[PDB]
Amino acid sequence: LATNKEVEREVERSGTLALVEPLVASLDPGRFAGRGPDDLQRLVPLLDSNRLEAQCIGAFYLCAEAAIKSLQGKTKVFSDIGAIQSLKRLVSYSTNGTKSALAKRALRLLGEEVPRPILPSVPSWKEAEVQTWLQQIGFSKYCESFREQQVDGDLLLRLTEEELQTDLGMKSGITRKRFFRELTELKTFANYSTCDRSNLADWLGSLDPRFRQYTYGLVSCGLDRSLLHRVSEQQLLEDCGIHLGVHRARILTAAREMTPDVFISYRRNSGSQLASLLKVHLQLHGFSVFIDEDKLIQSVMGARNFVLVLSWVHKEIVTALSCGKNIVPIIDGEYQEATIEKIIRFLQGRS
Amino acid sequence: REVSPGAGTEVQDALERAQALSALKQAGGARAVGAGLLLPAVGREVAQGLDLLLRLLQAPETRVQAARLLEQILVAENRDRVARIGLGVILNLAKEREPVELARSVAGILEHMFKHSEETCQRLVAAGGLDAVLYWCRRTDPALLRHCALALGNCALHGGQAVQRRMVEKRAAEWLFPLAFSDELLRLHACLAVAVLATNKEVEREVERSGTLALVEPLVASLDPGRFAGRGPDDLQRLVPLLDSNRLEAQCIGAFYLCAEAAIKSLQGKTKVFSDIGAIQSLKRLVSYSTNGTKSALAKRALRLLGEEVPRPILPSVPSWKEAEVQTWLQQIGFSKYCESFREQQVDGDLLLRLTEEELQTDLGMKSGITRKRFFRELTELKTFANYSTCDRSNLADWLGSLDPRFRQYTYGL
Amino acid sequence: VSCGLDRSLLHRVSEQQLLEDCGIHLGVHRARILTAAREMTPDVFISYRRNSGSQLASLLKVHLQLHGFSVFIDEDKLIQSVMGARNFVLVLSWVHKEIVTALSCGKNIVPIIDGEYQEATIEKIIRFLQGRS
């Protein structure tokens, strides 16, 4: 019922989907409880969907049927109904740990080879990652071309129809359309953490989950949610590669509708880690510090006050007395951290 | 080998058949004998005696001898088996933090379980956990902090874009500052963690405010990379996106670790996977476009340990290049196939900084658009590096580099 | 619907988009589509012996939710939730800690004792509730 999309939000309210996940993970798929090719084909559009629950159900039932049909029939209809490719896609792009385990168990019961999970940081892929991805998604025929042309992860996320037609040798329009389907499936899965700086991926994926693919195109051109309210359909079309006019409009309208305090001096060879503990404790409360030559004098001159931590130096101890500055020593010869809590309480009551 | 694994399995069966916490110290002694023994024997023995549930039973004292024994038996198989049902006992052990003889083993278990997957990291962060390591980063204990640093590192390498936002929102840079002081290994682990955190660009300014990056540079320049402290091809591939980035700190950390692993893998394996992960080209690019002196020295040391020729630094005054400079640059960046074409057509540094797509396609012989896009990537990397002092008179390069650092390439055209 | 459109966004599309992105070639159809498109927290915290008569807790869950009374049936989130629960229902056919949380704070309690149609009984109970709450 939740595979349907018109009633998904009303089957989500009447909470029983939350019982499917923690249930499949409980038991083992050795059940023996024969379907027939029609009933077996009724189960592929389950694990071909979203929602992460239908997918675990499909994996469970396919595991059961794989065990049964390998024991009794010694053969597999599963290649005819299209199961193996979807099970491999589950193992490849998974995030759950139960669904991928079941899909691995199924793929192994039949006889195919388990793919490994891909790395989600696409813009940092070398050529080997591209070759393994091509082999997994089914384009094993174009590995030699993608290798002799030396495509990175960047050159992959940025390739177009002309470079596919002319340079890589993908000659038919249907094969190009399949390739772009697989690519778009990969682009809504990538990381984009090493190139974003602005979390534009989530602003896009909030309008529509279909839009999270355009992030690399919007980012390689130097954009972000502060600059995005100035672009136009011409730039979105030519520089960023957004072809569907519906998406360009839904992005345009949505885009337009948008000195120190403490100078901790300390014996650097004895009782030093306590100076750093005080560093982090004061900084976590709002008191700028300066711990780490005359810059130390030039800084303690500007420091609001002082902290004498004891457990070269005669020149620094006289610079905190000459000028008019506050001093709060911290003697060490109970939790040391409860002590420092008390000290920062004394400070925030004092300073 | 065979008799040793058989004896280990026999002793393990006896000590499992054999109230109190007895024979657990015997299991610890057997694990020590196996680990300190080549070291594949302990791997085989651990995968043959890790009945993880049994150990998970003792844990909610006896909990000390249980946790101290689980720490050694954590391999990919044991890790995978624990991940399913091992997260309702250890996450609760982490809720209590009083004993130091136990917090050590809990920190170690958390360290291992942080290196499993993104689901396990996301489950060990919001549902408790990662608070045990940030809290135990205030107790000055030698061998516990050496785990609270490795765990904060593995939670940053693995895990995802959200776990790093979480680690920054929970102030894991500040709480890592104290760990970067004297050990000489705790500091290395802390610097690696902070580097991996600053590689992300969404939290770079908030990891910059909590000043601890300034400790990475002066630290790598201190010691020698002969350490011996084996990872695996996946962990090795985790280290290239560091030295492929900015910030000059992640780059030095990556160079240091690549030097260590190059020494190790040349001594023991006599072979190099480093060409598969893409290291050598990035190390050559580091040696080529370097401005620091420590980073380039380390990259030279690494490149020489593997067996490749060390490139020289290029001359930063591009508009004054003759043909020889263009040929050396071509050979360095990897277009050794077009050296004869560039030489026949006699490109200067000026004709290089000013060549377009039609002249590349027709006159130099670059037939495919992917090769031309690679070439323009390399060119644009070079144009944001040139001098432009002898042709500017107005310092327009800086007016451009003030808007966006990507715009400094347009100065010669302007 | 492959271009993302639906009933809410359809009133904003134009002929060029309908022609190029959706593949509607006949101009008559494009016009007849344009004009037609532009003329267009819990309440009950059921605690129960999970091994002793649990199905009645679920039956009460569904009978209650089918009327308008939210439920939180399914560690400390149970305390954090029963604190926010309007009232309580003790279904009877670890525990001493949950039975004292319904008295510590000021909350209503309507137990349901089990030691006639069970469902006629539950109809009566939900009638008592809708008369009370």
DSSP sequence for B107-162: HHHHHHHTTS-HHHHHHHHHSS-SHHHHHTTSS--HHHHHHHHHHHHHHHHSS-HH
Amino acid at C23: G
Size of interface A-C (CB pairs under 8 A): 21
B357 touches chain A (CB under 8 A): no
Q: Are the C-beta atoms of C15 and C30 separated by less than 8 Å?
A: yes
Residues A311 and A332: their CA atoms lie apart, in Å, by 5
Q: Which residue of B has its CA nearest to A278?
A: B178
The 3-class secondary structure across chain A, one letter per residue, is CCCCCCCHHHHHHCCCHHHCHHHHCCCCCCCCCCCCHHHHHCCHHHHCCCCCCHHHHHHHHHHHHHHHHHHCCCCCCHHHHCHHHHHHHHHHCCCCCHHHHHHHHHHHHHCCCCCCCCCCCHHHCCHHHHHHHHHHHCCHHHHHHHHHCCCCCHHHHCCCHHHHHHCCCCCCHHHHHHHHHHHHHHHCCCCCCCCCCCCHHHHHHHHCHHHHHHHHHHHHCCCCCCCHHHCCHHHHHHCCCCCCHHHHHHHHHHHHCCCCCECEEECCCCCCHHHHHHHHHHHCCCCCECCCCCHHHHHHHHCCEEEEEECCCHHHHCHHHHCCCEECCEECCCCHHHHHHHHHHHHHHHC
Residues C64 and C88: their CA atoms lie apart, in Å, by 13
Amino acid at B56: L
User: What tokens appear for B271 in the block?
Assistant: 């072979």
Residue of B297, B158, B292, B321 whose CA lies nearest to B238: B158
Residues A38 and A36: their CA atoms lie apart, in Å, by 6
Residues A63 and A54: their CA atoms lie apart, in Å, by 14
Q: Are the C-beta atoms of B389 and B317 separated by less than 8 Å?
A: yes
Residues C54 and C57: their CA atoms lie apart, in Å, by 5
Q: Which residues of B touch A52 (CB under 8 A)?
A: none
CATH number at B332 reads 1.10.150.50
Q: Are the C-beta atoms of B133 and B152 separated by less than 8 Å?
A: yes
3-state secondary structure of C87: strand
CA distance A69 to chain B (A): 28
Residue of B400, B403, B360, B404 whose CA lies nearest to B379: B360
Residue A338 class from Cβ within 10 Å (0-12 exposed, 13-18 middle, 19+ buried)? exposed
Cα-based distances in Å from C68 to B21, C41, C43, C133: 55, 12, 9, 11
Cβ neighbours for C78, distance < 8 A, ≥ 6 positions apart: C45, C98
Q: Which residue of A has its CA nearest to B197?
A: A194
Residue C7 Rama label (left phi>0; alpha psi -120 to 50; beta)? alpha
Task: Specify which residues A305 forms β-bridges with.
Answer: A326
Count CB atoms within 10 A of the CB of residue A131.
17
This structure's resolution (Å) is 3.3
Q: DSSP secondary-structure letter at B213?
A: G
Helical (H) or strand (E) element with B402: helix B396-403
Q: Are the C-beta atoms of B135 and B151 separated by less than 8 Å?
A: no
Sign of the torsion angle spanned by Cα atoms B367, B373, B379, B382: negative
Q: Are the C-beta atoms of B101 and B64 separated by less than 8 Å?
A: yes
B146-171 in b/e burial notation, b at 16+ Cβ within 10 A?
bbbbbbbbbbbbbbbbebbbbbbeee
CA distance B333 to chain A (A): 14
Test the B interface: residue of A266, A280, A281 with most B CBs within 10 Å: A280
B361 touches chain A (CB under 8 A): no
Considering CB atoms only, which of B119, B240, B244 is closest to A97? B119
Cα-based distances in Å from A337 to A185, A342, B379: 50, 8, 55
Residue of A295, A261, A292, A260 whose CA lies nearest to A275: A292
Count CB atoms within 10 A of the CB of residue A114.
14
Catalytic residues of C: 98
Which one of the listed residues A127, A316, A334, A337 is annotated catalytic?
Answer: A316
A244 touches chain C (CB under 8 A): yes
Unique residue bearing structure tokens 């085989």? B44
CA distance A66 to chain B (A): 23
Q: Which residue of B has its CA nearest to A284?
A: B174
CB proximity under 8 Å: A 250-269 to C? 250
Residues B375 and A289: their CA atoms lie apart, in Å, by 48
Residues B276 and B216: their CA atoms lie apart, in Å, by 28
User: What tokens appear for B154 in the block?
Assistant: 């593995």
Residues B386 and B366: their CA atoms lie apart, in Å, by 24
Instruction: Work out the widest C-alpha separation in chain C, in whole angstroms.
Output: 74
CA distance A246 to chain C (A): 7
Q: By what technique were these coordinates determined?
A: cryo-EM
* Cβ within 8 Å, pair C21-A245: yes
B98 touches chain A (CB under 8 A): no
Q: Are the C-beta atoms of A265 and A303 separated by less than 8 Å?
A: no
Catalytic site includes residue A316: yes
Could you give phi then psi for residue A284, rounded to 5 degrees?
A: -70, -5
Count CB atoms within 10 A of the CB of residue A158.
17
Helical (H) or strand (E) element with C112: strand C112-113
Chain breaks in chain A (C to N over 2.5 A) after: 33, 258, 292, 311, 333
Task: Specify which residues C91 forms β-bridges with.
Answer: C112
Count CB atoms within 10 A of the CB of residue B264.
16
3-state secondary structure of B404: coil
Cα-based distances in Å from B252 to A325, B204, B232, B257, B362: 40, 17, 21, 9, 41
* Cβ within 8 Å, pair C9-A250: yes
Cα-based distances in Å from B288 to A174, B297, B304, B323, C29: 44, 11, 14, 18, 63
Task: Specify which residues A85 forms β-bridges with.
Answer: none
B in contact with C (at least 3 C-beta pairs within 8 A):
no
B170 touches chain A (CB under 8 A): no
A63-78 in b/e burial notation, b at 16+ Cβ within 10 A?
bbbbbbbeeeeeebeb
Residues B168 and B197: their CA atoms lie apart, in Å, by 8
Rg over CA atoms, chain B: 26
Residues A250 and C9: their CA atoms lie apart, in Å, by 9
Amino acid at B58: Q
Unique residue bearing structure tokens 């004895």? A270
Count CB atoms within 10 A of the CB of residue B338.
16
Q: Which residues of A touch C9 (CB under 8 A)?
A: 250
Cβ neighbours for A170, distance < 8 A, ≥ 6 positions apart: A142, A164, A176, A179
Residues B322 and B389: their CA atoms lie apart, in Å, by 17
Residues of A in CB contact (< 8 Å) with B are 25, 95-97, 120-121, 124, 126-128, 149-151, 154-155, 158-159, 162-163, 166-168, 191-199, 222, 272-273, 276-277, 279-280, 283-284, 336-337
Task: Specify which residues A308 forms β-bridges with.
Answer: A265
Q: DSSP secondary-structure letter at C108?
A: E
Sign of the torsion angle spanned by Cα atoms B13, B17, B18, B22: positive
Q: Are the C-beta atoms of B133 and B141 separated by less than 8 Å?
A: no
3-state secondary structure of C105: coil
Amino acid at B231: R
Rg over CA atoms, chain C: 26
Could you give phi then psi for residue A291, rounded to 5 degrees?
A: -115, -65
Angle between helix axes B186-199 and B161-169 (nearest 10 degrees) is: 120
Q: Are the C-beta atoms of B410 and B400 separated by less than 8 Å?
A: yes
The 3-class secondary structure across B64-89, one letter per residue, is HHHHHHHCCCCCHHHHHHHHHCCCCC
Residue of B199, B206, B184, B319 whose CA lies nearest to B251: B199
For residue B361, the enclosing domain spans: 318-384
Residues C125 and A321: their CA atoms lie apart, in Å, by 80
Residues C36 and C38: their CA atoms lie apart, in Å, by 6
CA distance A212 to chain C (A): 13
Angle between helix axes B24-35 and B41-48 (nearest 10 degrees) is: 150
Q: Are the C-beta atoms of A46 and A4 separated by less than 8 Å?
A: no
Cβ neighbours for A184, distance < 8 A, ≥ 6 positions apart: A213
B in contact with A (at least 3 C-beta pairs within 8 A):
yes
A246 touches chain C (CB under 8 A): yes
Give the β-pairing of C87-92 and A326-327: unpaired
Taking CA C16 as the corner, what is the angle to CA C13 and CA C18, rounded to the nearest 5 degrees? 55
Q: Are the C-beta atoms of A159 and A180 separated by less than 8 Å?
A: no
Q: Are the C-beta atoms of B35 and B72 separated by less than 8 Å?
A: yes
C5 touches chain A (CB under 8 A): yes
Instruction: Work out the widest C-alpha separation in chain A, in whole angstroms.
Output: 95
A231-249 in b/e burial notation, b at 16+ Cβ within 10 A?
beeeebeeebbbebbbbbb
C17 touches chain A (CB under 8 A): yes
Residue C80 class from Cβ within 10 Å (0-12 exposed, 13-18 middle, 19+ buried)? exposed
Give the β-pairing of A330-331 and A326-327: unpaired
Q: Are the C-beta atoms of B279 and B259 separated by less than 8 Å?
A: no
Residues B284 and B290: their CA atoms lie apart, in Å, by 10
Taking the CA of residue A320 as centre, how many other CA atoms within 13 Å lie in the half-sphere pointing to its CB? 21
Residue of A294, A301, A299 whose CA lies nearest to A322: A301
Cβ neighbours for A17, distance < 8 A, ≥ 6 positions apart: A2, A11, A51, A53
Residue C89 Rama label (left phi>0; alpha psi -120 to 50; beta)? beta
Helical (H) or strand (E) element with C90: strand C87-92
Residues B280 and B397: their CA atoms lie apart, in Å, by 31
